Amino acid sequence: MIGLVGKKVGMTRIFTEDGVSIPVTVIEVEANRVTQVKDLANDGYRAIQVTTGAKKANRVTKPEAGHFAKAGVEAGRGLWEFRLAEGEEFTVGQSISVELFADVKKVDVTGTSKGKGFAGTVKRWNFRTQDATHGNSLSHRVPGSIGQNQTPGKVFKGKKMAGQMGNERVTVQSLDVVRVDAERNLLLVKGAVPGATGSDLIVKPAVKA
Amino acid sequence: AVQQNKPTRSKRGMRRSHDALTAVTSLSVDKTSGEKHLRHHITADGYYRGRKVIAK
Amino acid sequence: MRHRKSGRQLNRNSSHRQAMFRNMAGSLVRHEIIKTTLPKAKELRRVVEPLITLAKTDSVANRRLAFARTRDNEIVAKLFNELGPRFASRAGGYTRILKCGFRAGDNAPMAYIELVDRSE
Amino acid sequence: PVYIPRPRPPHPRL
Amino acid sequence: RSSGAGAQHVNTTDSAIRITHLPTGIVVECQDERSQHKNKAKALSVLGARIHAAEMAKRQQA
Amino acid sequence: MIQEQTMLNVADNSGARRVMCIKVLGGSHRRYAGVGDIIKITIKEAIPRGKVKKGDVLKAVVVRTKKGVRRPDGSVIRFDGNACVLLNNNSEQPIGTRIFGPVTRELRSEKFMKIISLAPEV
Amino acid sequence: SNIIKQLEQEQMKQDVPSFRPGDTVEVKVWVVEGSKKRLQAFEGVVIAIRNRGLHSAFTVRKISNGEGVERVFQTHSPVVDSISVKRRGAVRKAKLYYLRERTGKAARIKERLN
RNA sequence: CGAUGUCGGCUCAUCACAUCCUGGGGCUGAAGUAGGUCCCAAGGGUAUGGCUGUUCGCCAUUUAAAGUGGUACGCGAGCUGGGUUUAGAACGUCGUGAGACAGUUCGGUCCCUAUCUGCCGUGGGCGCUGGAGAACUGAGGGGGGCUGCUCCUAGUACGAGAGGACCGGAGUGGACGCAUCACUGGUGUUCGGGUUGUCAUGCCAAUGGCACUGCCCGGUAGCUAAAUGCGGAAGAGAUAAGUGCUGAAAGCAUCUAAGCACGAAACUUGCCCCGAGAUGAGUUCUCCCUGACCCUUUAAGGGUCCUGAAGGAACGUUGAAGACGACGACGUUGAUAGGCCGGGUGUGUAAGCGCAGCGAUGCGUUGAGCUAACCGGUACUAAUGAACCGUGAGGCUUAACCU
RNA sequence: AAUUCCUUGUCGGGUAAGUUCCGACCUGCACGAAUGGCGUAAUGAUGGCCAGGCUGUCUCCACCCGAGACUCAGUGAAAU
RNA sequence: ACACAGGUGGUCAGGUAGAGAAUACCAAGGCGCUUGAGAGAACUCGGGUGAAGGAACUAGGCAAAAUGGUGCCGUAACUUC
RNA sequence: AGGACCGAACCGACUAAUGUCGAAAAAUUAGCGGAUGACUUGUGGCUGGGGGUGAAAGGCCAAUCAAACCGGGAGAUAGCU
């Protein structure tokens, strides 16, 4: 089925009765109401695009205000889109709560990774740092050789070098569900998820069933 | 470090194409005096938001 | 990558940085308005406001903690007697920043940092 | 220049 | 490749030959001259001499 | 955390005093051992009345670590010294008849029964 | 946040005995030996307390037979059952990591008796 | 020969299969396991120490394996200089001698601030044509694809006994990569405390400056792993080796000549990421622009007044975003940054006062005081009213639709 | 052996494992008694090896403090 | 060759602590060394710390780390005593 | 008394790093060896080019040494570029 958009608010741990304390992440889930239902008659694929949160009525633009008045729902932050799985059909404006997570056992969380910035080769691609003594001059944390010789004459595309680390769209898969709370509107997941406290998280059902 | 051959006037111009400085062109008008000043900056006489904030 | 860190380095070690923050906070208490670069004023907002916060309540030990900073008797004498009963009603935010062009020596962002005063 | 120095001690290759 | 000294040829050319005779366990190491063949002939002569000596020693012990 | 060239004290009274871990057995390219993993040791110091002499290369099992072992509740058990029990290289069956110092609960699995049977604590 | 604090305050137990670091604290902890559920004892000297609310823990250093055994314990975990202070130690330092190198006569500390 | 720095080592790898293992099979002098040989298959992995400068080799112990080669028998404008080839000196040999020795050994300065291609990232202009805000489909490209041990099947088949299956399922491991501080740690020169030598505040007390943060002890938040989860797949299509069905040429036989059904970590998917600059420039939703004139080479022409629309840009507050750009939140209709209150955490009974002691010092007020980067609030201060860019509904041809 | 090609000649010790080292075996290519031999207390920024402590050398790097590297204002090269 | 981290002989030379002209802080006296302001990326230098091992790294304990002062006890082989 | 020991001034450069179109055509940083004698240094002289000098490297002789620099034979010579 479809996934839901949530906010990461810290991490905690759940003490089970037998003794095992499991580290959990508190993903709060707001009213993921449906903004538009795309069909095959106009796009060639069936999907639903939704939103979450709540914007103030000074930041939302008139194109976004008209797109939200097309659905009639309250203006919320961001827009996401989930493909349908041919077994269900959603209407425009349906308040989808966390009750869809009550039946599933494992989920997949996709989030914007925490930006590490312009990182080196050792931090990014886990290269071995060379020996810091026995005559080492100006060659401590450099990657060293990046190509062979005259006969290739170039560096191969896909070379593991220093550069941008973080701000990616990484996905930690196969995360166990712990507790689905409807009164507090929470979603406790097992393990760690990408992103810091306050980032958006796409929590979809596990494709590796 | 050492070059093979010198670049052109065209290469120098296409390099200095992004060296063009940008002017602000957003000089404001004070409420009381009306003197020209920048955004979030006081005037030459010390006027800011109409109030004499420098007292000097 | 300084995620959730505060404290500007200002291209100086901690001894010189603390010493010039001491001297500049003393000058701002003594003269009530000074003119300096903008990040020094931004960090001096984190220095002068705890001094006034300590100067909210006059006692025996508060004079010694206000003498532990600024290293001067005239600065703590102007504290607790003149700034104390005059900033009594306002709670926090006693300072004010005024951006004033750029310096002609090195093109640095200039700023008058002052208190909410000079109605004498 | 007045003085032009002795060049760099080169690679052996002997 | 060979150990010792002498020239560039020691770096790139091999000039060192080790021959092991499997059912007897006799190892012959030659690092004498420059070309391999002139060392292959010496290594085969030393193989023949050591095998003949090890067989005649067993015959004289028997 | 027991890796190569690590000096360990002998837990039982088999005879050795100081041993040196030469390889963490089980799985290639492995850094260090765990709770009750098998390591290969050499003997650096032994008593005159020991059943093994100085220089015997044999298998052992780590029982106490300075890095600490982690119970699944969230706690850690750190010991003030590394310790091992010597094993006879094809069937484990430890040499010493008395074992000093406590052990960890995760060592109890189907083959180290004599060690936890001779354990005075835990 | 209020969400994290509300999720933590519903799980913290309200009968935690207050003890300063340095007290001779005896802790009885559950353990599952397969088909058995045994309450075992552990008596030692507290050398560190890390208060984190629900995530709070405390060390109990014990000099057992042979060498010392250091073992942390989570305060609000269900695996522990009882915390009883036997002696009230009178150290003036929060952490007691310097007691690790000291064995025997130099390991004991002062009693409060205030 | 008006200069191509080579051996070995460290880091970084790329490619071929004449395949070391994993995988699918045929023969066997294959009862089972363990084997010998051979075909297809390069998707992944392919040691740790002593010696030697050594590649290599031997030894010790693992592993499923310790593959062969190419890339200037890779890689010094990435790094040493141990060895080989500068200048010193010696041992042995030759030469009357100066000197010589691929016969060692002792020791001996290895430069360069990146113009071009390439690679890792990140931006500006313009285009897609009326513009803008978003949401995606998706061409194509990239990342990964390793497997041990134990148990059930099952001591089952097989086997006189010893030994011991194939296939399938589950759990726990090692490496790799990703994610995060929930636990444990490290750092935490912005927090607290102890102490030495000196100086200063007119002196005691107290505090501050210097001596590597003076020496240390811890330690908030962030970063980080040694800490904790995750994954290599399941499934589908087309196949290589190989096993086949029907079946003539050639009354038989035949996997192939017509056809059909199987068949691998190899290929494409399926797992994840980038991505319409894919100039072939895609699709959907929404917002906004409906004012007159003269000149005329009546051209998809230029110029004048009025309006600036949606939106963007500039400035400031700034960020678990960031070299700079860029991205995200906010700008008084406010919780974006700083300050303040309370809580939490950390250091640990501040100063003053009172008591005991000749004194150092000890106790009570007090588990106080101080709290950085944390949390929940609070406009107390700073984000001003405005100015700038972007416009009068949008070209030609053809067909279907309403007039 | 500063000597030695064959050679990592052979034995023992040190290490789990030692072409280095030590004590010898003499089969001295090609040691040798003033171009001196054998030992030798003390000494050496001397060559090699081993033992204890000690540690980021390494396993395996992680964080922090200042000086550069990044941006802005002023002056402003060079090899080629 | 420079308003250059180099070199240049002799005299005076204090307080505290210190065996001392060493070293730490000061008096008399001279200076802040003729580019500053931001941000706190990869990488480079001088450093500090670090769980567990303690040389497994490397040609090589190279570099770093560690010992270090006064009084007292005691100090082996060998020797030219 | 010691061509004695540790260790400042002073003398020299053994290791590693910074530099290596450097602060400088040999330097600096952190460790070093001697430091009452075969020590160091100032001042003023003497020894000089097929020579001087050398606790001996074929080193040094004005940043140039298996035969210094300056001027002249000399526009030497060059089957060589």
From Swiss-Prot, chain A:
The modification N5-methylglutamine is found at residue 150. One of its GO terms (biological process) is ribosomal large subunit assembly. InterPro entries: Ribosomal_uL3 (IPR000597), Ribosomal_uL3_bac/org-type (IPR019927), Ribosomal_uL3_CS (IPR019926), Transl_B-barrel_sf (IPR009000). Signal peptide: none annotated. Keywords: Methylation, Ribonucleoprotein, Ribosomal protein, RNA-binding, rRNA-binding. Methylated by PrmB. It comes from the Bacteria. GO terms for molecular function: rRNA binding; structural constituent of ribosome. It holds the Pfam family Ribosomal_L3. GO terms for cellular component: cytoplasm; cytosol; cytosolic large ribosomal subunit. The modification N6-succinyllysine is found at residue 38. NCBIfam families: L3_bact. Part of the 50S ribosomal subunit. Forms a cluster with proteins L14 and L19. In pull-down experiments interacts with CedA. One of two assembly initiator proteins, it binds directly near the 3'-end of the 23S rRNA, where it nucleates assembly of the 50S subunit. Belongs to the universal ribosomal protein uL3 family. This is Large ribosomal subunit protein uL3. It comes from Escherichia coli (strain K12). The gene is rplC.
From Swiss-Prot, chain C:
GO terms for biological process: cytoplasmic translation; ribosomal large subunit assembly. The keyword Ribosomal protein applies. GO terms for molecular function: structural constituent of ribosome. One of its GO terms (cellular component) is cytosolic large ribosomal subunit. InterPro entries: Ribosomal_bL17, Ribosomal_bL17_CS, Ribosomal_bL17_sf. Keywords: Ribonucleoprotein, Ribosomal protein. Pfam families: Ribosomal_L17 (PF01196). NCBIfam families: L17. Belongs to the bacterial ribosomal protein bL17 family. Requires L15 for assembly into the 50S subunit. Part of the 50S ribosomal subunit. Contacts protein L32. This is Large ribosomal subunit protein bL17. It comes from Escherichia coli (strain K12). The gene is rplQ.
UniProtKB/Swiss-Prot annotation, chain E:
Belongs to the prokaryotic/mitochondrial release factor family. Methylated by PrmC. Methylation increases the termination efficiency of RF1. The modification N5-methylglutamine is found at residue 8. Peptide chain release factor 1 directs the termination of translation in response to the peptide chain termination codons UAG and UAA. The chain holds residues 228 to 289 of 360 of the full protein. This is Peptide chain release factor RF1. It is found in: Cytoplasm.
Curated annotation (Swiss-Prot), chain F:
Gene3D superfamilies: Ribosomal protein L14. GO terms for cellular component: cytoplasm; cytosol; cytosolic large ribosomal subunit. One of its GO terms (biological process) is cytoplasmic translation. Keywords: Ribonucleoprotein, Ribosomal protein, RNA-binding, rRNA-binding. HAMAP family: Ribosomal_uL14. Part of the 50S ribosomal subunit. Forms a cluster with proteins L3 and L19. Forms two bridges to the 30S subunit in the 70S ribosome, contacting the 16S rRNA. In pre-50S ribosomal subunits interacts with RsfS, which may inhibit association with the 30S subunit. PANTHER family: 50S/60S RIBOSOMAL PROTEIN L14/L23, LARGE RIBOSOMAL SUBUNIT PROTEIN UL14M. This is Large ribosomal subunit protein uL14.
